[PDB]
């Protein structure tokens, strides 16, 4: 499978979206699993999930790697509400556009916030909920905030450069030797190609700070069977938020990988793929 | 499979064991997995692991449910050293007696301590290491100690009764409705049948308090791939000890079940069986 | 100072209170400090705070040891709302009755919940806020719940006896040797003298479970300078709730005593008195 | 009091120190309190503790602000052992040189490690032990390591500049507006004046990594009454290490300041001074 061969576009009309263009990558034909990416500069569906799409399609799922509004090849946008909620509406727009009745959701950090808000706003349209270091969930009990990777996400947004990109990825990833030229260049190109996305993010950040993403008080509403994953060494969203989900969501479990940063799905792809597919099939 | 049909005995001679009788239950013929039980009154191999032996044998393993010295049908004993270490020597005695070169180990609480000490003392004789709320690991950062279930373990040892047994199990188990007459009676009978085991445990407790079981300082020596499980609601060994293992063992992961007490293998048998078999095969 | 010599009554009329009788013990004449007790059977103002009233009066404060509605010598009551909120209204009733414009509040567990709700409902009527293991604050990230001491509080409410009282105090207190006959008898007598209080508590518990006391989502509203204390070995309200306050209240500090249960003010009276008086004077 | 007017030198001869020059600042004449600084580039006794020396001398203590070997005006040095232990020997050398029989110790981060090692090696020569975010204590249960401020400490050591210094202080301090030119310049000058100190630190870092400073396993030996302080927002040494001390030292308490980074003594000087003096007098 390739980015090019799986690349699709769809216009959406959900709420304050009107004929809004969403880019995604799709493969397979079984039950739908929608995978949702983080919010750093240059993030997108394909580069975040390319280590996953194949095993999941192989296991029989239809996989959709969605670009959130204001990321990668989806339309530019300035948000006045918390990103998790706006992205969730986009997911629902996408699903109605494609005649998808229920989907499983997978999401890291911002995409986790996205998945969380979707489960809350639309409980009839979700199957299983899968979270990797989901953002949004308020103050840590242990981590000073803003987290190390958050500060770097904002620095990169405001003063983009290959050098600052590398610094940021070095913090995202436990194993530094995973930071190949290819990974860097791929991020650099998404950054270079849509400079408007950066300015828009910082604007949206001002209109609705991360403090407003916090959906903790509503976790008890979630009736989705939930799989929570964390990297032990995640410098982007702190590990004790994993405990907070486990205590507050009715039917949750938590899996924490050693020697893993903010991209469990990428840094521990094989075991990640095994646990989540097993969960999707059997939980 | 039944207790009776799988029941075996073997004499061991490792260190301060001489012709010491160990009871176990065995089934299957593939790679050996030795499962090790907790230390409460009436604990034993078969009643702790009967929800596991079948799926594991079905997956191709040879499973051995071992009674630790001074439990169930294994010989009575008074220990002057920490139980985790003495039990580990017994496991090695058992393996040499049966011509087993390497085994996978599964152990909850005391059996976890057992598995930990075995991996440390005999790294050439272990494959994979599997821990469910392992005891021994020193002070909690959050839980006052002795833990709630520990106090009840000692109360039951000293004043045994069906009523105190029920109180203890009510604390061990998240879901109270799992405490059937059958479960109670089975524990009551192991208690009633070997009263010497109780007096011996309290004696051993005095000669080597739980404070001496702590092997934390040596966790870095463990080269076994490690799977750590915890119940979120474990009132016997606290959850933050799961973090301590994840940070200190080189190649570990942690899985925490919601709505689960001190017996993950029993309260969440299906998912437990799936995760550990997958881990044994693929990690 | 004695219970008898300081004993006062006042009728209150705040909201769903009409000519409601509140017992308190008062001494000193300076700035008012109102001290509020926990919710176990037999709790009351004087026996909870008798190690404190003297040093605080000596430091120049006017001290009021209040019995909450449905405790000790205050009127019996059946509550349909969360106790923290109803007690707070009682405090405001008491202050209006006595022409007190602002008070400092001190409260452990239920009394902490009380102090929290008061600061939220009436920010113009509080000076400094002092909390010792305040209840109410939702799920722990580490402690299974109900906490050990909560279960014992409910057992004692439902089957009152001197023996169960002793068991409960043994869990409340780190140092067991502090559990003198005098302490036990004093609690036994408050229990024996107002049996209606017990039945009423369990009734109120049913109408508004502890789950409804949780005021976490509103902590950011509190503008009071806040002093949080915890016993490290508190088996009643878990220690990580202390972190939750420190991160969520604007101007807070946290002090944790070693070898201390659920009554810091009693078990570590001298240092407790020194820290809080210093805080009242200088913070 | 000024740096210049309090500035003293003393040669020491303890172990692998021979006629080794130690700079300190001293004022007052009562019981000795020795204050020990952190290990970042440019750290020293006077600039770390100038907000403290006055109130402590005013309270009647003799205060000694010691420069550790290889810092500020003390002799340059390359260490092959963990810094906490070598600094402790220097403190003992200093005390024997000045005919000081017992001292109270105050130390943040590296100086905390220093104070810890001193209490362990020389229990007859310490009074009270005071720790502010002490380094050395092994892995965090929550914080990825190296901590954010550690990475910056090493960056500054290796590529010193005013700009990197500012970045580092911005991480050390909760309130950014405390980073005046004066503070920056003072650090820049200690850096510029003794470039050998930087190269030596990195060399010593290689010979004895921070991993070897960990004295956790020996905390139970400490019989000093202990006061532990932490900033809630400390990005240099993580907050849960404060819990680890509280559970492992026999007679400890913990005080955590809100809105405080790695220098509690400086960022919250007034309350810091009040708590520690009160502790020194009364605990
Ligand atoms: Na490479
Ligand atoms: Na049933
Ligand atoms: Na006594
Ligand atoms: Na300024």
Coordinates of C-alpha atoms in Angstrom, one line a residue, chain A residues 141-142 144-148 151 171 232-235 239-240 243, chain D residues 141-142 144-148 151 171 232-235 239-240 243:
Chain A
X141 CA -0.6 15.2 39.1
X142 CA 3.1 14.9 38.5
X144 CA 4.9 20.3 35.1
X145 CA 2.9 21.7 32.2
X146 CA 3.2 22.8 29.4
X147 CA 4.9 19.4 28.8
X148 CA 8.3 19.4 27.1
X151 CA 6.6 23.7 24.2
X171 CA 11.8 14.6 22.2
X232 CA 6.4 5.2 29.5
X233 CA 8.7 7.9 28.3
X234 CA 6.1 10.1 26.6
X235 CA 7.3 13.7 27.0
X239 CA 1.6 9.0 31.8
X240 CA -0.7 9.6 34.9
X243 CA -4.5 6.3 35.2
Chain D
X141 CA 7.9 6.5 38.5
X142 CA 6.4 9.2 36.3
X144 CA 10.9 10.5 31.7
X145 CA 14.6 10.9 32.4
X146 CA 16.9 12.7 31.8
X147 CA 14.7 15.5 33.1
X148 CA 14.2 18.6 31.0
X151 CA 19.4 18.0 29.4
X171 CA 13.2 26.0 32.8
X232 CA 5.4 21.4 42.3
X233 CA 6.7 22.6 38.9
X234 CA 10.3 21.4 39.4
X235 CA 11.6 20.4 35.9
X239 CA 8.3 15.5 42.5
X240 CA 7.6 11.8 43.2
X243 CA 7.4 10.7 48.1

